[PDB]
Amino acid sequence: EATDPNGYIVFCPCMGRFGNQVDQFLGVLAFAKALDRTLVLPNFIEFKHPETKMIPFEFLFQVGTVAKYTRVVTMQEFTKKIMPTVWPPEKRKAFCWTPRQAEPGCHSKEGNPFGPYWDQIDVSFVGDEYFGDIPGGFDLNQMGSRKKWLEKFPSEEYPVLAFSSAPAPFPSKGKVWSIQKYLRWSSRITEQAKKFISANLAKPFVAVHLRNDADWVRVCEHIDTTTNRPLFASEQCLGEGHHLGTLTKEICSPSKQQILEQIVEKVGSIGAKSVFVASDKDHMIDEINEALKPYEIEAHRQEPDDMYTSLAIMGRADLFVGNCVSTFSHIVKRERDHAGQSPRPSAFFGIR
Ligand SMILES: Nc1nc2c(ncn2[C@@H]2O[C@H](COP(=O)(O)OP(=O)(O)O)[C@@H](O)[C@H]2O)c(=O)[nH]1
């Protein structure tokens, strides 16, 4: 019915894959609340055979729950009710930090997933706006920055702030992690997880995330122990600014030997009766089963490995062993920390 007189934020989760998108989305939630505009829930993005698939927020997560954090609308609602009445085509401007080259601009629809995401909701942009000139950019907790935002893009002139990418830092700040208390798997996904667990995973079970597709080597080449800077999600196991210790290649990219040894250790730590493995490539089922044979238990995977059901299963594990650098693992860690009545235990490869 009524539309928000403070205006709206819509954005493309245009950086990285699902872990990346969620990580920034928590920040966008914090941003929308502080600014006090209603957030249009994004379509998440999945890169497949030839196509870029936009996934409705509500296919993955419950709107009811996220609405307990801040004012939200589904993309379906935005497209049907809000856009036709508050955001006519002549007012559709894109927002980004600073102009860049392909005439310099936001280039909000150049390439993949940029073009397809906006095509999905029949948005073409008629002009660009920049916010990078505001001191502290999208950090609304810098004194004066919020006032400056409301001065530069008032809701009367700009009913919809439409961002080329998430208006949030990457990696996420520690202060926003607990916001994923407000992300709850759709019933569909939770039921797929529950069925796999009851059929295949005698309790208590250890769930492990094996991050090992071809893009990972380069990720872990980033590690230099002398400077010990945060790398993607590493602060999830080493604390903000790595106050707990040193990021190592053993943490980022454990060897097969190290993986098997630590699975065995974690099985023994809980008297586990089964192991679940989620992986982007090599689930190591044969190697793990061989390593677990003296202990008369097995490892199990989904066939095929659906990334969302996999995250949900790892969230329900008695013990989760994740990859500390991975933002995909970070989703599980944050669910285990914040989703429930009380926190459920997590561990990571290479960290004591
Ligand atoms: N099916 C499945 N896919 C995965 C798994 N781990 C990674 N992936 C894929 O690889 C992407 C990794 O990107 P991202 O989620 O941002 O996490 P990060 O790169 O590990 O920080 C995921 O979003 C998935 O598309 C897994 O355990 N199962």
Numbering used by the authors: 24 to 125, 132 to 381
What's the paper's own text on this?
POFUT1 α-fucosylates serines or threonines present in EGF repeats containing the appropriate consensus sequence, C2-X(4-5)-[S/T]-C3, where C2 and C3 are the second and third conserved cysteines. In the present study we have solved the first crystal structure of CePOFUT1, which serves as a conserved family member. The protein shows a typical GT-B fold formed by two Rossmann domains. A cavity for GDP-fucose is localised in the interface between the domains and a contiguous solvent exposed pocket for EGF repeats was identified by electrostatic and docking studies.
To determine the structure of CePOFUT1 we obtained three different crystal forms. The fourth one is a crystal-form-III in complex with GDP, resembling a product complex. A comparison among the different crystal forms revealed minor conformational changes within the two domains (RMSD of 0.25 Å among apo crystal-form-I and soaked with GDP-fucose, and 0.66–0.86 Å among crystal-form-I compared to crystal-form-II and III, respectively) and some differences in order/disorder loop changes, such as a loop in the N-terminal domain (residues 125–134). The larger RMSD could have resulted from differences in crystal packing and not from bound ligands due to the small RMSD among crystals-form-I with and without the ligand. CePOFUT1 is a monomeric protein, as determined by gel filtration chromatography and confirmed by analytical ultracentrifugation (data not shown). Unlike Asp242 or Asp244, Arg240 played an important key role in binding and catalysis.
